């Protein structure tokens, strides 16, 4: 557990995580899923407007202590 | 009939019966489950997956084939930019100069129904296209202004808005939707036409076809 980010949601809603810089961001989805109890695929998270993949990671998307990962809805329309 | 027999099955089996989840084609960092896929089934509404990958496969498409230097923003884009002004996307566009490209994509996401914005800075010109006849007079005004911003903040350089435009394409214009669910095809059919500096000649009728060829070109991450 290296860095500690915050998974703000679109109604502001904050959540803290210390994660493994060495691993895959999926497991931070799955639990932000839960410890809110949402359908993971209605959730999509982005870092400055760039699209968090499951095997993507921290190192990878280069982020520094306390940085946001932002969290959108399932977009639809007619 | 331009639809051949076999990608007809193909097309078939992505939007029948299956896990939701499937994964069915990666590309752009998006996984395109067959949950997303059905969006395209007949009167489905149309959601961020789809269109974000079909706008995706536009800057490919052109890219490939010689059509302008197309640059696309992500259905987030406008929302997010309509809540928290420039500095909640200022980020968002770090690796790219947008006044280099040609043609700039925005897909827009009004309550219930989706809308397409194109800049074209080749024109210096904003056009604000809705398939259900609606006004884009203040998206316009914001979407401008961010530009002012990015380029104040990015090259730090005022933009002569003397020489900046934007029209909202009328009804009579453009073809409307007639039934309530092709909001998002016409947005990517608008997209689709625009990017390759084609002039609009399709009509609802093509909508339903459209969709069951969006579903081809999306497996095969290629336009046809």
């Not at chain 1, 860095?3 to 109604?11: C, E, P, S, Y």
Request: aromatic share 10%; net charge positive.
């Amino acid at each position: 557990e290296y860095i500690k980010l915050k998974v703000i949601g679109q109604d502001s809603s904050e959540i803290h995580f210390k994660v493994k810089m060495t691993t895959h961001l999926k497991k931070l989805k799955e639990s932000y899923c839960q410890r809110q109890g949402v359908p993971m695929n209605s959730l999509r998270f982005l870092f400055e407007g760039q699209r968090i993949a499951d095997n993507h990671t921290p190192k990878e998307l280069g982020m520094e202590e306390e940085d946001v990962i932002e969290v959108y809805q399932e977009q639809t329309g007619g | 009939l331009e639809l051949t027999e076999d990608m007809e099955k193909e097309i078939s089996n992505a939007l029948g019966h299956g896990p939701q989840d499937e994964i069915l084609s990666s590309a752009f960092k998006l996984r395109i489950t067959r949950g997303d896929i059905q969006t395209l089934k007949n009167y489905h509404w149309l959601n961020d997956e789809v269109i974000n990958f079909y706008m995706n496969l536009l800057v490919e498409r052109n890219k490939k084939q010689g059509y302008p230097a197309l640059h696309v923003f992500s259905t987030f884009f406008y929302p997010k930019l309509k809540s928290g002004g420039y500095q909640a996307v200022k980020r968002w566009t770090k690796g790219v100069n947008l006044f280099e490209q040609e043609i700039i994509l925005v897909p827009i996401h009004r309550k219930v129904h989706w809308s397409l914005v194109v800049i074209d800075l080749r024109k210096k010109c904003l056009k604000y296209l809705d398939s259900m006849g609606q006004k884009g007079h203040r998206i316009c005004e914001i979407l401008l202004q961010y530009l002012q911003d990015e380029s104040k903040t990015k090259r730090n350089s005022d933009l002569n808005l003397l020489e900046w435009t934007h029209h909202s394409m009328k009804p009579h214009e453009i073809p409307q939707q007639l039934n309530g669910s092709d909001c998002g095809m016409f947005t990517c059919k608008y997209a689709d036409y625009i990017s390759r500096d084609k002039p609009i000649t399709f009509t609802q009728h093509q909508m339903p076809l459209f969709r069951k060829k969006m579903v081809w070109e999306i497996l095969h991450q290629q336009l046809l």
